[PDB]
Design an enzyme around this catalytic site. Structure first.
Site, PDB file in Angstrom:
ATOM      1  N   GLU A  49       8.173  -0.127  -5.136  1.00  0.00           N
ATOM      2  CA  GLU A  49       7.242   0.709  -4.384  1.00  0.00           C
ATOM      3  C   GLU A  49       8.073   1.490  -3.370  1.00  0.00           C
ATOM      4  OE1 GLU A  49       4.496  -0.919  -1.509  1.00  0.00           O
ATOM      5  OE2 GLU A  49       2.826   0.309  -2.306  1.00  0.00           O
ATOM      6  N   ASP A  60       0.758   2.160   8.169  1.00  0.00           N
ATOM      7  CA  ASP A  60       2.010   1.436   8.340  1.00  0.00           C
ATOM      8  C   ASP A  60       2.167   0.835   9.729  1.00  0.00           C
ATOM      9  OD1 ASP A  60       3.544   1.363   5.873  1.00  0.00           O
ATOM     10  OD2 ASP A  60       3.261   3.575   5.985  1.00  0.00           O
ATOM     11  N   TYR A 175      -3.615  -3.392  -5.563  1.00  0.00           N
ATOM     12  CA  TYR A 175      -2.815  -3.825  -4.426  1.00  0.00           C
ATOM     13  C   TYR A 175      -3.715  -4.709  -3.572  1.00  0.00           C
ATOM     14  CZ  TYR A 175       0.721  -3.334  -0.692  1.00  0.00           C
ATOM     15  OH  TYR A 175       1.692  -3.593   0.220  1.00  0.00           O
TER      16      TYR A 175
HETATM   17 CL   LIG Z   1      -0.349   0.210   2.692  1.00  0.00          CL
END
Ligand SMILES: [Cl-]
Ligand SMILES: *Cc1c(COP(=O)(O)O)cnc(C)c1O
Ligand SMILES: N[C@@H](Cc1c[nH]c2ccccc12)C(=O)O
Ligand SMILES: [Cl-]
Ligand SMILES: [Cl-]
Ligand SMILES: [Cl-]
Ligand SMILES: [Cl-]
Ligand SMILES: [Cs+]
Ligand SMILES: [Cs+]
Ligand SMILES: [Cs+]
Ligand SMILES: [Cs+]
Ligand SMILES: [Cs+]
Ligand SMILES: [Cs+]
EC number: 4.2.1.20
Lengths: 256, 394
Positions: A49, A60, A175
């Site tokens: 990734e 983030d 995910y």
């Molecule tokens: Cl993420």
């Protein structure tokens, strides 16, 4: 997305989980980042990734915020990141490559054009960090027209409607950031979702094994790799050694 | 803090340097989790049946009791793959190591049986195995060292302290303190710091569970007593565990008496030592007046250790289990008797348990009693030892 199908079929035959490291492209420079990524693969990463530095990485935390800053300090641009992606794919024909993108970088020069460039360089999936499933239509649609898997996050606060959308809309893998965990995993399978990779704070081998035991197809280390880069900036050689040892250990934990 | 009680009464604990505590806590967590995991249990059961050969026979030994009112059965751990009961728990520990994501195994060995058991489990399950062995034991056990190497393990001689099992035990712990992130320490008996006495009991308890089912099928009641030799304590606790709550069933552990308790040349700390702290545990141990750990002795290397697991000390203290000793000569007579009367060559370790059962019979031949001896291992490995003693003796 086919590289993911092939990978998961191979792993299923070996009763093995996937281990997928995240890194920011160009952190801490282009040359070192290419070496880092080669080290990750040789040590046994099943897929990558890869983040493109963005001015405003909302999804983030501090580790990746700092990685973005290092890459920008080295002058890294998305164009340079696509040059890197071509070099990586050229050296490594089967490993699945996923991008972690911010919406503005995908929308900037046209969403279709962005996915076409992804297809041309040999990227396999794209996760757009600030596009929820509700806003995802033009992104997923352009992804699938270009043979790119659109990756969705299944967050801890996921409800049934969301599980069904992510299962329908996603490809490659789901995910997972984690309703109890067993429930999320069971429901995703029931709804024929892309195989789940557990990405919630995966930093130790035992977490990789626990993820597979829980029914997930493997695990994503969202920041641990980046932390190793950060801890070893002054010594590139030692940085690679520590990466190789860590990925080695994490991958060992995924084996039957 | 721990998930499980580290003590059996006053015995047990976690007496390790601070740096090892995370290793012990991680293992305890993985164990508690494994014990609730049906998949882990199914994996363990599958290896025990299809690889190791469980269930083991329960053999009624008629010739050896003829003309007395003793009925003797032998639980045949000698028929388990590897030739001793150690195989049961090494398979469980190897599975725990894999559950924790570990790729490497560290183990101690004296007699070399545990080294072999660790190596074979590692070979099967794809783990990289290293074994510590006191230099004196290395020289004594060339067959076992070769087996370990055939199975792909690394054998590391230990020259510190007395170059024997306790020293190997210390060195294994030293290595693990540095390596625990990637390596599991496969302790070889029901002793050492918590959680090992508890893990090894639970990974050996099928011995007593099978024995109970088998004796019920064959005799329609429980045994009057179950009898097992005690080196560190694993085979005996594996036989005893499922009978602890059957209060009519006697639990008899047999420590090695060596040349005789009075000579000081023995391995019987539970009855002839005193409580101390060594090898991560508070337990009976053979020690000097000023608290150095003594050298033990037995004809049988498998019983030759100056301490014992803490659960045995506890069961003795409350009078639930009774502990006795058997000398080298008594063990050698039982070894010979079993070969001649039953065609079974027993381990010299197991021969101590058999010797005590024979004594129970012979002392009181008209006493009705139904006894089970845990025949913890086979004694092909002992024939040179036995040959050499018989020759010397004339
Ligand atoms: Cl993420
Ligand atoms: C190792 C061994 C023993 C002694 O160890 P415990 O932990 O006390 O069981 C006894 N018998 C045999 C055959 C052995 O191999
Ligand atoms: N000496 C035997 C049994 C043994 C292993 N580890 C021990 C620790 C304590 C007492 C006995 C043991 C062997 O190595 O096969
Ligand atoms: Cl259970
Ligand atoms: Cl040899
Ligand atoms: Cl019956
Ligand atoms: Cl009784
Ligand atoms: Cs899907
Ligand atoms: Cs059998
Ligand atoms: Cs009899
Ligand atoms: Cs594993
Ligand atoms: Cs002993
Ligand atoms: Cs000794």
């Amino acid at each position: 997305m086919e590289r993911y199908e092939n990978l998961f079929a191979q792993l299923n035959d070996r009763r093995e989980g996937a281990f997928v490291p995240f890194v920011t492209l160009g952190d801490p420079g282009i040359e070192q980042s290419l070496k880092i990524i080669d080290t990750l693969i040789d040590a046994g990463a099943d897929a990558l990734e890869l983040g493109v530095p963005f001015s405003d990485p909302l999804a983030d935390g501090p580790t990746i915020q700092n990685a973005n800053l290092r890459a920008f300090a080295a002058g890294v641009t998305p164009a340079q990141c696509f040059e890197m992606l071509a070099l990586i794919r050229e050296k490594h024909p089967t490993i699945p490559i996923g991008l972690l993108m911010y919406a503005n970088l995908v929308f900037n020069n046209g969403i279709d054009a962005f996915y076409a460039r992804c297809e041309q360089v040999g990227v396999d999936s794209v996760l757009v960090a600030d596009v929820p499933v509700e806003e995802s239509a033009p992104f997923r649609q352009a992804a699938l027209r270009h043979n790119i898997a659109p990756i969705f996050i299944c967050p801890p606060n996921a409800d049934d409607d969301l599980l069904r959308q992510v299962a329908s809309y996603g490809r490659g893998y789901t995910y997972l950031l984690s309703l109890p965990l067993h429930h999320l995993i069971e429901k995703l399978k029931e709804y024929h979702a892309a195989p789940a990779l557990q990405g919630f704070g995966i930093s130790s081998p035992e977490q990789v094994s626990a993820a597979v035991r829980a029914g997930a197809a493997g695990a994503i280390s969202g920041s641990a790799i980046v932390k190793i880069i950060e801890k070893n900036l002054a010594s590139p050689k030692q940085m690679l050694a520590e990466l190789r040892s860590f990925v080695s250990a994490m991958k060992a934990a995924s084996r039957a | 803090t721990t998930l499980l009680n580290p003590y059996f009464g006053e015995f047990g604990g976690m007496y390790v340097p601070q740096i090892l505590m995370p290793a012990l806590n991680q293992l305890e967590e993985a164990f508690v989790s494994a014990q609730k995991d049906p998949e882990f249990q199914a994996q363990f059961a599958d290896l025990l049946k299809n690889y190791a050969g469980r269930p083991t026979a329960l053999t009624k030994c008629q010739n050896i009791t003829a003309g007395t009112r003793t009925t003797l059965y032998l639980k045949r751990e000698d028929l388990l793959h590897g030739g001793a009961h150690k195989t049961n728990q090494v398979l469980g520990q190897a599975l725990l190591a894999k559950r924790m994501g570990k790729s490497e195994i560290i183990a101690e060995t004296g007699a070399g049986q545990h080294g072999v058991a660790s190596a074979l489990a590692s070979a099967l399950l794809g783990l990289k195995c290293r074994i510590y062995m006191g230099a004196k034991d290395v020289e004594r056990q060339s067959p076992n060292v070769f087996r370990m190497r055939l199975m792909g393990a690394e054998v590391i001689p230990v020259h510190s302290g007395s170059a024997t099992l306790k020293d190997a035990c210390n060195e294994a712990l030293r290595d693990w303190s540095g390596s625990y992130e990637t390596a599991h320490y496969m302790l070889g008996t029901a002793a050492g710091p918590h959680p090992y006495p508890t893990i090894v009991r639970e990974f050996q308890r099928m011995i007593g569970e099978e024995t109970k089912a088998q004796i019920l099928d064959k005799e329609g009641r429980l045994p009057d007593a179950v009898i097992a030799c005690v080196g560190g304590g694993s085979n005996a606790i594996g036989m005893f565990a499922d009978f602890i709550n059957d209060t009519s069933v006697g639990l008899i552990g047999v420590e090695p008496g060596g040349h005789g308790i009075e000579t000081g040349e023995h391995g019987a700390p539970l009855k002839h030592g005193r409580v101390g702290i060594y090898f991560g545990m508070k337990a009976p141990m053979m020690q000097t007046a000023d608290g150095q750990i003594e050298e033990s002795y037995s004809i049988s290397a498998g019983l030759d250790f100056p301490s014992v697991g803490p659960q045995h000390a506890y069961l003795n203290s409350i009078g639930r289990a009774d502990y006795v000793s058997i000398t080298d000569d008594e063990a050698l007579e039982a070894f010979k008797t079993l070969c001649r009367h039953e065609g079974i060559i027993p381990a010299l370790e197991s021969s101590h348990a058999l010797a005590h059962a024979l004594k129970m019979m012979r002392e009181q031949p008209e006493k009705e009693q139904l006894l089970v001896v845990n025949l913890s291992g086979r004694g092909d490995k002992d024939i040179f030892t036995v040959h050499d003693i018989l020759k010397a003796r004339g």
